[PDB]
Every structure is written in C-alpha cells, then in structure tokens.
C-alpha cells in the first residue's frame, strides 16, 4: 500500500547536513584534540541533540581482538535529580560494563578505571542541568584528572545553574551558541526539506513568497518546528491523495500552532 | 519418521568456530607456556563457558607407557559458596581419582599430589565468584607452589570480588574481555548459523535487511539469544510442516522475550 508506506516513512526521523551541524563538528574536534572543557547552549528546538548524535555516530568505537573497546566519544543523558552514583552508573553501562551494587566510592573508582581503560577523549552530557549541584564536583574531577574534554549541552537555564558555582563557571567558560534560522538561510533550508526529506511526487514550491509567509509565521525559525510542520502537512495531504502541499492545507496545519 | 529425526537434532547443542573463540584459545596458549595466571571477563551470554570447554577438548589427556595420565588443562565450575574442601574435591574428581573421608588438610595434600602427578599446566575455574573469599588463599597457594596457570572466568561481579583483596588482585591482574556482536559481525554470524546449524532444505536467507531488523531487536547482540531464537523458529516451523523459517513465524517466537 503506497500511501501506508509513506505514512510509515514520514513519521520517522532523519539527520540533514546543515551549517549549524557542520559548525559544531568542526568546533568539537578542536575541543577533543586540545582536551578543553566547554559548553553548547541555545533555545530548545535548535536541534542540539541531533547535532550531538551526528557527532557520536561519527567517531565510531574501535574494536581490538579481546581488548575492551576504544571509545573516543561518550554521550550520556542523565535522569532528573541525578546523583553522583547515577552519573557513574551510566558512564559504566555506556562503555558496556554491568554495574554491581556498591558504595559511591566503588562506582567512582570503577568509572575512573573504565574511562582510562576505554581511552575516552570526550564526554558529552546532554541536558546538563538535570545534575544535582554536588555532582559537578565529580565532573570537574573527571576533567582535571583524566585527559577528557567534558562538553555540557543545555539551554539558557543551564547558564542560570552554572553561575551558582564559581568552580564550574570558570572551567566551562568557552561556549558555542545554537541560533535560529532567518533570511536566506531559512529560505534555502525549506528547499532542502522539500527535496531531501519529504519526497512528495510533485514540487510543493515551499520557498515561494506566498508559502514562506505561512512557514515563517508558523516556525519562528526553529528547525525543530520546521521538520514537525512539514512532516504533519505531508502525512495529512497524502491521506487526502494530493501529490503536493498547497496554501490552504498548510494553513490548516499551521493554524494548530 | 523423518520429521522426528530433525527436532531431536535442533533441541541439542553444537560449537561454532567464532572469531571470539579463536581469540581466547590463542591468548590462553600464550599464558599456558609462559605459566602466567590471568582472568577472563564478560557478560553472561557472550560464549565464555563454551569457549573454555572447547579449549579443554583441545589438549585432552595423554597416556604414555607406565606413567600417570598427563592432563595439561583442568576445567572446573564450583558450586555456590564453595568452601576450601569442595574446591579440592572437584580438582581431584576431574583427574579421575577417588577420594576417601579426609579432613580438609588431607584433601589439600591429596590435591597437590595429583596436580603434580598429572603434570597439570593450567586450571580454568569457571564462575569464579562462587568461591568463598577464604578459598582464594588455596587458589594462590596452588598457583605459587606449583608451576600452574590459573584462569579465573566470570562476569563483572568477579572483579568486584577480587578488588576486595590486594593479595589476589595482583596474582590475577592480567585480563581478556568477551563482548557482544555488532555490525557486519552480527550479519556474518547469522549467515553462518543458517548454513552451519539450521540446515533446512530450502534457504531462509536471514541476512536480508527486513529479517536482520527482527533479529537485531530480538537478540541485542548476545550469541545466546541468537542461537535460541533461530532454533526455536526452526523447531516450531518444522512442526507445522513448513520447508523454511519465514517473517511471520520468526516474529511469533521473538515476542515471547
């Protein structure tokens, strides 16, 4: 069923080479080679986690016969009110060790051992502000002691949390900011979704002035709304049998925002 | 009945010459001539007991004229909370000697006498963490007093036990890790299982993209699950008079897990 195949495809996800992802990877290679700790910040739909998964899925783990894996980059995501044990538990599991019951110092000692054993160069912590205030002592320690670039990813609240501890603030001072699309850059990006992501049977001409007004007012420049609006409009218009997106059907999806 | 022959076959067990098995035997052969004690670690479904048993089926006992049997590799699995007597009883019984009503310091001396007499080069202790903490003094005494390589085999808990005692950690510091299957290695192994183990009259072709998605999700890289799943799908399928495993019957099995 050709319709149902497109509804099963379009509700999926992709990664697109965009300037704001290519920029991050050139920057994170700089921090990894230089071993310098830093932070990535910006508004919640700019696509920072996709840009970091595109980094983790490049730089693949290397396998040597019967050795533990050599893992250049670690990406973890903490749970809410993450304590020192929960950070160490996750780093240990990500490098493929099972964590056995122990005191906080057993988890600390085993984590330091597996980070130094797996040859880790960079540790990326998503949603860094889920960390409890004391755990940053253990993150500073990992970065002081081992040759590891810690990268904190968050939004503008993360800075409101980092600024409550002088020891973290003066270490995680170097930063890159993820920004919103505009002008020619929003215009050019809409064409990339039409031709690389949506795969509709005839051109929808989404970059035209009568259509960019609709899409501009809907998306505000957020890449996370652009992908959401254009998948929802494609799913909906195919279930009505059109080979395109058009003015009225896109205004139906945008009127939900 | 032709059908009754095949279900009796698939229910049993067989050993597949995986790279990981070859990697262990080549490593333990370095350790056997060098006479160095070591440990093997890895997750519980990764192939460890079978890889150690295959090394015991190599190097089977010699029997030249007018001598005791020479037994280069001993392999044992302790029971749970194994005491100093019970370890000596297993080493003695593996070497085919009967043992009679000793106190523990008789069992110790009779064990040292048969370990010398049989010319044992290596002692593989499977599930090493079943050992009570005090029995390691007898394992170190075997390893130091005799020219024996002891190989402790176990899970990530074994490390937690060993790290509680400096005396042991140091005799057994070196290590090899068993790990899970991934990428092209998972795909090559599924192809090998189909032709090597399953042997159905018509091809099921499970290296096909659509079928590897079911198996990768169902098995998560453990050689254990992969085998059980492929066997259960051949058994069930054969009982219903089919010539192959197919997409629907394989999903019927994998859902139980």
């Amino acid at each position: 069923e050709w319709l149902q195949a497109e509804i099963a495809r379009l509700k999926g996800k992709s990664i697109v080479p965009l300037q704001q992802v290519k920029t991050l990877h050139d920057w994170l290679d700089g921090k990894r080679k230089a071993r310098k700790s830093c932070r990535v910040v910006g508004e919640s739909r700019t696509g920072k986690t996709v840009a970091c998964d595109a980094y983790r899925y490049r730089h693949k783990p290397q396998q040597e016969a019967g050795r533990p894996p050599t893992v250049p980059v670690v990406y973890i995501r903490p749970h809410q009110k993450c304590g020192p044990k929960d950070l160490f538990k996750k780093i240990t599991e990500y490098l493929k060790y099972r964590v056995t019951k122990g005191t906080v110092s057993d988890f600390r000692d085993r984590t330091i051992e597996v980070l130094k054993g797996c040859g880790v160069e960079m540790l990326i912590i998503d949603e860094a502000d889920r960390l409890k205030p004391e755990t940053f002592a253990d993150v500073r320690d990992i970065a002081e002691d081992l040759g590891i670039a810690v990268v904190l990813v968050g939004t503008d609240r993360l800075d409101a949390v980092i600024k409550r501890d002088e020891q973290v603030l003066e270490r995680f001072r170097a930063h890159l900011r993820f920004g919103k699309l505009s002008g020619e850059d929003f215009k050019n990006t809409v064409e990339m979704w039409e031709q690389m992501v949506l795969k509709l049977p005839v051109s929808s001409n989404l970059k035209s002035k009568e259509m960019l007004r609709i899409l501009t007012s809907a998306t505000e420049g957020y890449i996370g709304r652009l992908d959401e609006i254009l998948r929802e409009a494609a799913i909906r218009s195919l279930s009505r049998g059109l080979k395109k997106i058009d003015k009225a059907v896109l205004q139906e999806v945008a009127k939900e925002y | 009945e032709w059908l009754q022959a095949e279900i009796a076959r698939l229910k049993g067990k067989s050993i597949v010459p995986l790279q990981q098995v070859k990697t262990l035997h080549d490593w333990l052969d370095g350790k056997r001539k060098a006479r160095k004690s070591c440990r093997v670690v890895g997750e519980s479904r990764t192939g460890k007991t079978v890889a150690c048993d295959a090394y015991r089926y190599r190097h089977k006992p010699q029997q030249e004229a007018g001598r005791p049997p020479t037994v280069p590799v001993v392999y044992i699995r302790p029971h749970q909370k194994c005491g100093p007597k019970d370890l000596f009883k297993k080493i003695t019984e593996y070497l085919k000697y009967r043992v009679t009503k000793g106190t523990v310091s008789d069992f110790r001396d009779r064990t040292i006498e048969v370990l010398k007499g049989c010319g044992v080069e290596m002692l593989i202790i499977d599930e090493a963490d079943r050992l009570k903490p005090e029995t390691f003094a007898d394992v170190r005494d075997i390893a130091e007093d005799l020219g024996i390589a002891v190989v402790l085999v176990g899970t990530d808990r074994l490390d937690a036990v060993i790290k509680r005692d400096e005396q042991v950690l140091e005799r057994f510091r070196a290590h090899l890790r068993f790990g899970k299957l991934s990428g092209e290695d998972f795909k090559n192994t599924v192809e090998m299982w189909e032709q090597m183990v399953l042997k159905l009259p018509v091809s099921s072709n499970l290296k096909s993209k659509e079928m590897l998605r079911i198996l990768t999700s169902a098995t998560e890289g453990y050689i254990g699950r992969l085998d059980e799943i492929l066997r259960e799908a051949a058994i069930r399928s054969l009982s219903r008079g089919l010539k192959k495993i197919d997409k629907a019957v394989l999903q019927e099995v994998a859902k139980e897990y």
């Binding site: 999926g12 990664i15 899925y57 690389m196 | 990428g183």
Partner: peptide, 14 residues
C-alpha cells in the same frame, strides 16, 4: 548532498 536516516545511523553504529 548526503542526508541520513536516524535508524540507519543506529544500525551502522558500534
């Protein structure tokens, strides 16, 4: 220019 399926990236990973 190349675009990636987020599930193909998962399948290709270590």
């Amino acid at each position: 220019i190349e675009v990636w399926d987020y599930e193909q990236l998962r399948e290709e990973y270590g």
